[PDB]
Amino acid sequence: TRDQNGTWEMESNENFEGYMKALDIDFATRKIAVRLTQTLVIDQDGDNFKTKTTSTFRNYDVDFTVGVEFDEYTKSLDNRHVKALVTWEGDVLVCVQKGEKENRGWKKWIEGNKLYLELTCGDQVCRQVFKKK
């Protein structure tokens, strides 16, 4: 399925620290963030996505249209400009953020009743799993 609609709660988060270091997020932000349960809420209508990731701490809103290149300024992440593009490879949703960091982006797919999110930067891969609330 390409339907990723839902309120998804984080079950697991592997190597978030390595990914965040590859991004140059400061040590203290990394230390808080690694401990936090995330909730990802995806509103998907055709090609249009509206995403909100929420935690007790900081939140990140990301909206995009599949197949439509978009500028991003990653404020209160690593504060960089990237050229982002989200497309489908079969039922994997693939984001590539072109810019200063090598191999930036994330692969979003679907397996059984879970959402899998694989965040990449440089040589680092962070693997997250979410279940519907």
The helix/strand count (H/E) of the chain reads as 2, 10
Six token digits for residue 64 = 């995009």
Nearest CB to ligand RET, comparing residues 62 and 66: 62
If one asks whether residue 85 binds ligand RET (CB under 6 A), the answer comes out as no
Q: E strands, 3-123, where?
A: 6-14, 39-45, 48-54, 60-65, 70-73, 81-89, 92-98, 105-108, 114-121
CB 42 within 8 A of CB 6: yes
Q: Which of residues 18-47 bind ligand RET (CB under 6 A)?
A: 20, 33, 38
CB 69 within 8 A of CB 38: no
The residue from 13, 82, 96, 106 that contacts ligand RET (CB under 6 A) is 106
The residue from 7, 60, 114, 127 that contacts ligand RET (CB under 6 A) is 60
As measured in angstroms, the least distance from the Cβ of 64 to ligand RET is 9
If one asks whether residue 58 binds ligand RET (CB under 6 A), the answer comes out as yes
DSSP code for 15: S
As measured in angstroms, the least distance from the Cβ of 57 to ligand RET is 7
What residues line the site for ligand RET (CB under 6 A)? 20, 33, 38, 51, 53, 55, 58, 60, 62, 77, 106, 108
